[PDB]
């Protein structure tokens, strides 16, 4: 119960065998797997008291578990379909309720791999009339043309991570909400005084985490092949 | 305990005001009950829970829950809304002896105390060009709230709240953004009631 789950972020196509792990060190008999999914909570898959059982909970279908030992705890998407896309949590618990969460498995289930795609990533500088009016200046970073919705954003002034002065949408839009396998777009301010921004010395990146292809996948099309990459871009301070 | 029920998945408070998040169960015989917290990129933690001990349960940063067996509820309250409270919070209930299980969730929201505003629209420029730029929409206080848009070429963002820490200062924004060539600032947020006194430069 350090509880700790594999992988961490995982990415595949429809149709596929896909396998979750949690292990853990104190032995506990009792071991769960939950997903999580926006509006619904978390809702219980599979659970097992013992080596020798394991009970449904109330979204067992498509998936099955094994308690191959005290300390693990194994759940398999039988044939990975769109909608078992969802963060998946495992935990433990003692005989009085004692629970402890693994981290998260962000799973994302693509019908056709072909469609992923890295973002491209730019900055807005602030504009002159905000930094007249406030003495204040606002950066943007657009996140565009990615493919699926599974990147982090962070904020990086003179090369160490702020969170300070930062707002990121909760969730990307669709730029073409009509299709099932649309693009995605993010965006995402951080705030400075105008006397920061107006310092040439300073110098502002917006990254963009992106979770895609493996070395692994097959790629059959021109264009780059859309591996988990870091996307950035930047602007320095700007005496004006 | 057969179930749980949180009512609202978000809601609102003002800053500085008083927490207030439901939770109410169904389970003739009382259960132990149970409030988890989740942060933007994180996983759960447990702020506080009801064993059969005290009624009155206090726990991390403030944050307390008084189990009430004659209206089934255990409500979660804290005194005074911090920006940092911003979170989804988990009510749970243990059930068939064996697990817990959990409500809905309800994502609290925020509302910052503005007491200047200065609404505005800029155009802020990309630092490459390629000769994009976007609009932002800001320093509106809580009675404003953007629209989606009813063009498909033009896309607008939710309201964000930034907390500047370096000046002790907040501020709402929303962006816009175009590839279309009739598409300019002074008409983004059309669909969105804005303030009258918006400032748009320049």
């Known amino acids: 119960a350090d509880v700790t789950q594999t992988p961490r972020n995982r990415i595949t196509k429809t149709g596929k065998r896909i396998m979750l792990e949690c292990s853990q060190t104190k032995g506990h008999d009792r071991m769960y797997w939950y997903r999580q999914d926006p509006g619904l909570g978390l809702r219980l898959i599979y659970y097992?008291?013992?080596?020798?059982?394991?009970n449904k909970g109330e979204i067992s279908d498509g998936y099955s578990v094994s308690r191959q030992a005290q300390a693990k705890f194994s759940l398999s998407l039988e044939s990975a379909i769109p909608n078992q896309t969802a963060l998946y949590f495992c935990?433990?618990?003692?005989?009085?309720?004692?629970?402890?969460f693994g981290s998260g498995t962000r799973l994302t289930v693509v019908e056709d791999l072909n469609k992923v795609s890295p973002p491209e990533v730019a900055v807005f500088e602030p504009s002159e009339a905000e930094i007249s009016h406030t003495q204040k200046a606002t950066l943007v970073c657009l996140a565009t043309g990615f493919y699926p919705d599974h990147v982090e954003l962070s904020w990086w002034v003179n090369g160490k991570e702020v969170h300070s002065g930062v707002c990121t949408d909760p969730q990307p839009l669709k730029e073409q909400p009509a299709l099932n396998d649309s693009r995605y777009s993010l965006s995402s301010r951080l705030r400075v005084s105008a006397t920061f921004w107006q310092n040439p010395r300073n110098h502002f990146r917006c990254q963009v985490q992106f979770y895609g292809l493996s070395e692994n996948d097959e790629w059959t099309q021109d264009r780059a092949k859309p591996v988990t990459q870091i996307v950035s871009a930047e602007a320095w301070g700007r005496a004006d | 305990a057969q179930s749980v029920t949180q009512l609202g998945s978000h809601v609102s408070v003002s800053e500085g005001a008083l927490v207030l998040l439901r939770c109410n169960y169904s389970?003739?015989?009382?259960?132990?009950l149970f409030w988890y917290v989740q942060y933007p990129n994180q996983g759960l933690q447990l702020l506080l829970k009801y064993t059969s001990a005290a009624t009155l349960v206090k726990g991390i940063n403030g944050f307390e829950a008084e189990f009430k067996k004659s209206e089934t509820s255990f409500h979660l309250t804290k005194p005074s809304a911090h920006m940092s409270d911003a979170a989804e919070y988990f009510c749970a209930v243990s059930e068939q002896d064996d697990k817990i299980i959990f409500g809905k969730g309800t994502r609290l929201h925020i509302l910052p105390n503005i007491q200047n505003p200065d609404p505005a629209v800029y155009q802020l420029r990309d630092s490459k060009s390629s000769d994009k730029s976007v609009c932002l929409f800001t320093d509106f206080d809580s009675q404003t709230n953007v629209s989606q848009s009813k063009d498909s070429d033009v896309y607008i963002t939710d309201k964000c709240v930034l907390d500047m820490r370096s000046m002790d200062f907040k501020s709402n924004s929303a962006v816009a953004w175009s590839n279309k060539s009739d598409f300019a600032c002074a008409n983004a947020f059309n669909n969105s009631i804005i303030p009258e006194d918006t400032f748009f430069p320049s």
């Open positions: 389970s003739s015989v009382p259960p132990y």
């Open positions: 935990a433990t618990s003692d005989e009085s309720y004692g629970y402890t």
């Open positions: 097992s008291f013992d080596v020798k059982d394991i």
